[PDB]
Amino acid sequence: MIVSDIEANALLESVTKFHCGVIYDYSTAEYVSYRPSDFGAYLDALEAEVARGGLIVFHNGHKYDVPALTKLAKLQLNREFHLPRENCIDTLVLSRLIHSNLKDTDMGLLRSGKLPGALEAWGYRLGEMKGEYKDDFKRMLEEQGEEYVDGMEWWNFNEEMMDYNVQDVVVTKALLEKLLSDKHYFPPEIDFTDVGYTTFWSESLEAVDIEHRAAWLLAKQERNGFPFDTKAIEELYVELAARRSELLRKLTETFGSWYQPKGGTEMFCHPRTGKPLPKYPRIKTPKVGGIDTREYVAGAPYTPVEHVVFNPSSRDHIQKKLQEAGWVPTKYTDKGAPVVDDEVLEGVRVDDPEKQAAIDLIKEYLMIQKRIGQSAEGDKAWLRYVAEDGKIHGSVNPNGAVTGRATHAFPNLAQIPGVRSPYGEQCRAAFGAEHHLDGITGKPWVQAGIDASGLELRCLAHFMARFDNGEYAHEILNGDIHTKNQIAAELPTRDNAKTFIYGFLYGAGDEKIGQIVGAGKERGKELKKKFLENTPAIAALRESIQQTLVEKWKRRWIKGLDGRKVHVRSPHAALNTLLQSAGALICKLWIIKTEEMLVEKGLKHGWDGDFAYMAWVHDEIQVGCRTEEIAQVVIETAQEAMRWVGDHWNFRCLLDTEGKMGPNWAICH
Amino acid sequence: KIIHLTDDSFDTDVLKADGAILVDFWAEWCGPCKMIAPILDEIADEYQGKLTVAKLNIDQNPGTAPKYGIRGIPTLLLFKNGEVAATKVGALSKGQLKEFLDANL
DNA sequence: CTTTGGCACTGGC
DNA sequence: GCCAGTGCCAA
Ligand SMILES: Nc1ncnc2c1ncn2[C@H]1CC[C@@H](COP(=O)(O)OP(=O)(O)OP(=O)(O)O)O1
Ligand SMILES: [Mg+2]
Ligand SMILES: [Mg+2]
Ligand SMILES: [Mg+2]
């Protein structure tokens, strides 16, 4: 077993040079440095360890080092370098599994001071290394009179870089041992720094293997990227911008501008009394000035003001104008501010007909801005993230949520507007395999979308089996469960039924339920007891969960399907923890088993192959396929993998998937 | 004795009144504005004949002040033949106002 | 007491 | 530019 790390000239997307690398070998117990001209040697050392059936530990190597080495080996030495997945360990992946209850800076991509809770020390050091290095570099430059440019610290190799490389491995080794000392994931009788790869995976908790496989696969997905229709979005943007302008014109016509105090530095005191009137706007008493075409007069106080135009994106302005028209707020926040969300706006009533109608314009404006922000103007907008290859390469933290679910960002591809929401068709349609032309034939690729059916309700069935002998597990298979619930609850759409049942299942109050279905708290009661009485085992499961965890905590974690510890945050959110985690672990093993089966059939993963993962949205995968025949196999294979996962964990409820073939996300979901 | 302007009556009442008109742009929530107010009531009848005192609440009439670049209140604009002949910002004592007016009349 | 997440936009220092 | 307060987008 060896621990390693490299330093290169840029992020994976544009990296072109290997600066240096360091390797600590457990069998010799020594650190060996490899400078620019030692690149070939560095690679040989890694392949040698592979030849022994050994292991290579990297911190975030799955997403950076490994694929970067493959790329740099081709470019610099014209060598084929491909470390096998089974020989690699990733301390970042491991810490995200062990300390799943903590946040991290995603290797410095996130501002640490913004994250809640504490951060693991070793990992904190590692994620901050580049920023620390950058500081030492700038400092040393200013000390020698040179000016600092962008991020020149990465352009050329140097001994400061080499020292940081060495420090990475020392810290990474320490992190590793710390992680390997957790008896729950790694049995005490085995020295995991002294065994072959096959032993490492087979003797450790199943979760260790699953996370590393999920990370390897997801890193590949990121590299594949999601084909994006840039032109369609730029046109959607023009359309939205014009509608925004017209709405602004109409609104600034109905709700005129006004002045407010701004710039007051002095306190206003009553002339006669002299007592401070902190309520009155702050003023200014000009020092110089007299009766001299100057406008001010020394000692003659005035209130500095500013002119402000109505801004529809300002809940404050809105609240101000609506009350000025007779609106009396019914709900406020824990700051005094009156609630101004779509639900409240929808309920506002005023006399002036024009102002009343203006409320709809305001709701439309806020929505339009919501789309412009996500698609084009926001810092994380799609148009700002499209790459040269015409694809958006969203980032994915495979185990970023406490429940074992993954998190998505830059931009967050798991929050694209639904096809049934305003402008959702266009948004959704811009993400599609059809927008990728085959590297050989130039023909558009096809998309295969697969989604687990009634996932978390089936997880409920599973855990309720010991209480109801599988009745629910059986009845849930009688037609579509959500459509069946929609009818019983008399809801307008299947989506409404889904958000209803889950809200209910996870403790939504009577009022909250009412809101969800668009009614009152009394209607919320009806529904709550209606579905609760129709399946009393739900209460039994809840009681059992409670008795196990609470006594003050009797134990603050649930044992996941693969054996890991799943941190519980609240007794009231415990059932959600149990079911969301089960569902998350099922889907994770699922996407892994799916690709593994496609490859066993001979299919190749990549744009220069047969299929390519473009996105994973919790219990949904969207896969690009070179042909329709391949799309058909992906769909069929995804269903087999799911039944396999269900059998693998002796699940008490049958598991299913629904697949769709089409050119884009609008049609495949 | 004082002329209370509106956005719609401003043009004909001020810009065409051809004579001396002192306009006071104010707001109820302004301390200084509340200060020079009493002063204006007296200046009114005292200069009754050689000047006209007009007031415009900027909250009720939001369209006029911006055209004059108001930056603070109370703002005192002395118009002459539809044009600004002199301006002063802040709560001036009666003495200073009388000076400003006599000096500009 | 729905839960797990990302992210935009106003407004204060 | 940092941060609290709100509120919407998804699963
Ligand atoms: N509103 C919600 N609140 C809490 N958890 C939710 C909510 N919506 C979805 N989830 C969880 C439970 C189901 C899981 C996947 O979402 P999805 O929309 O695919 O539901 P599902 O799998 O039950 O439905 P379907 O059979 O239509 O695909 O995410
Ligand atoms: Mg590194
Ligand atoms: Mg589903
Ligand atoms: Mg889904």
JSON list of N, CA and C in Angstrom, two decimals, chain A residues 120 168 187 258 306 309 329 351 415 432-433 478 578 624 647:
[
{"chain": "A", "resi": 120, "resn": "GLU", "atom": "N", "xyz": [-13.69, 18.44, 9.79]},
{"chain": "A", "resi": 120, "resn": "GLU", "atom": "CA", "xyz": [-12.60, 17.54, 10.17]},
{"chain": "A", "resi": 120, "resn": "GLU", "atom": "C", "xyz": [-11.28, 18.24, 9.83]},
{"chain": "A", "resi": 168, "resn": "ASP", "atom": "N", "xyz": [1.00, 17.12, 1.58]},
{"chain": "A", "resi": 168, "resn": "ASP", "atom": "CA", "xyz": [-0.29, 16.50, 1.28]},
{"chain": "A", "resi": 168, "resn": "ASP", "atom": "C", "xyz": [-0.27, 15.03, 1.70]},
{"chain": "A", "resi": 187, "resn": "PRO", "atom": "N", "xyz": [-12.52, -3.86, 10.71]},
{"chain": "A", "resi": 187, "resn": "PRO", "atom": "CA", "xyz": [-12.26, -4.82, 11.79]},
{"chain": "A", "resi": 187, "resn": "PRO", "atom": "C", "xyz": [-10.86, -4.68, 12.37]},
{"chain": "A", "resi": 258, "resn": "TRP", "atom": "N", "xyz": [-40.52, 56.93, -5.09]},
{"chain": "A", "resi": 258, "resn": "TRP", "atom": "CA", "xyz": [-40.63, 57.75, -3.88]},
{"chain": "A", "resi": 258, "resn": "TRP", "atom": "C", "xyz": [-39.25, 58.01, -3.29]},
{"chain": "A", "resi": 306, "resn": "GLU", "atom": "N", "xyz": [-32.81, 59.87, -0.92]},
{"chain": "A", "resi": 306, "resn": "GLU", "atom": "CA", "xyz": [-32.49, 59.26, -2.20]},
{"chain": "A", "resi": 306, "resn": "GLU", "atom": "C", "xyz": [-33.81, 58.91, -2.88]},
{"chain": "A", "resi": 309, "resn": "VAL", "atom": "N", "xyz": [-36.89, 53.73, -7.19]},
{"chain": "A", "resi": 309, "resn": "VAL", "atom": "CA", "xyz": [-37.88, 53.22, -8.14]},
{"chain": "A", "resi": 309, "resn": "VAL", "atom": "C", "xyz": [-38.40, 51.87, -7.67]},
{"chain": "A", "resi": 329, "resn": "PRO", "atom": "N", "xyz": [-51.60, 42.50, 6.52]},
{"chain": "A", "resi": 329, "resn": "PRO", "atom": "CA", "xyz": [-50.91, 41.21, 6.66]},
{"chain": "A", "resi": 329, "resn": "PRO", "atom": "C", "xyz": [-51.50, 40.33, 7.76]},
{"chain": "A", "resi": 351, "resn": "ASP", "atom": "N", "xyz": [-58.90, 47.23, -2.91]},
{"chain": "A", "resi": 351, "resn": "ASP", "atom": "CA", "xyz": [-59.97, 47.89, -3.66]},
{"chain": "A", "resi": 351, "resn": "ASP", "atom": "C", "xyz": [-59.58, 48.28, -5.08]},
{"chain": "A", "resi": 415, "resn": "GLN", "atom": "N", "xyz": [-31.94, 20.29, -9.87]},
{"chain": "A", "resi": 415, "resn": "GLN", "atom": "CA", "xyz": [-32.97, 21.29, -9.59]},
{"chain": "A", "resi": 415, "resn": "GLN", "atom": "C", "xyz": [-33.47, 22.00, -10.87]},
{"chain": "A", "resi": 432, "resn": "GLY", "atom": "N", "xyz": [-30.15, 17.47, -23.34]},
{"chain": "A", "resi": 432, "resn": "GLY", "atom": "CA", "xyz": [-30.48, 16.25, -24.05]},
{"chain": "A", "resi": 432, "resn": "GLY", "atom": "C", "xyz": [-29.37, 15.63, -24.89]},
{"chain": "A", "resi": 433, "resn": "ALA", "atom": "N", "xyz": [-29.39, 14.30, -24.99]},
{"chain": "A", "resi": 433, "resn": "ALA", "atom": "CA", "xyz": [-28.40, 13.56, -25.78]},
{"chain": "A", "resi": 433, "resn": "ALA", "atom": "C", "xyz": [-28.45, 14.04, -27.24]},
{"chain": "A", "resi": 478, "resn": "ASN", "atom": "N", "xyz": [-50.51, -2.89, -6.67]},
{"chain": "A", "resi": 478, "resn": "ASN", "atom": "CA", "xyz": [-51.80, -2.92, -7.37]},
{"chain": "A", "resi": 478, "resn": "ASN", "atom": "C", "xyz": [-52.05, -1.59, -8.07]},
{"chain": "A", "resi": 578, "resn": "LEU", "atom": "N", "xyz": [-34.47, 7.00, 8.03]},
{"chain": "A", "resi": 578, "resn": "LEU", "atom": "CA", "xyz": [-34.50, 5.58, 7.70]},
{"chain": "A", "resi": 578, "resn": "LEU", "atom": "C", "xyz": [-34.88, 5.28, 6.24]},
{"chain": "A", "resi": 624, "resn": "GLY", "atom": "N", "xyz": [-26.98, 8.93, -22.13]},
{"chain": "A", "resi": 624, "resn": "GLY", "atom": "CA", "xyz": [-26.84, 9.17, -23.56]},
{"chain": "A", "resi": 624, "resn": "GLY", "atom": "C", "xyz": [-26.51, 7.86, -24.24]},
{"chain": "A", "resi": 647, "resn": "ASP", "atom": "N", "xyz": [-32.96, -8.04, -4.38]},
{"chain": "A", "resi": 647, "resn": "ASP", "atom": "CA", "xyz": [-32.67, -9.40, -3.96]},
{"chain": "A", "resi": 647, "resn": "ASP", "atom": "C", "xyz": [-31.42, -9.43, -3.09]}
]
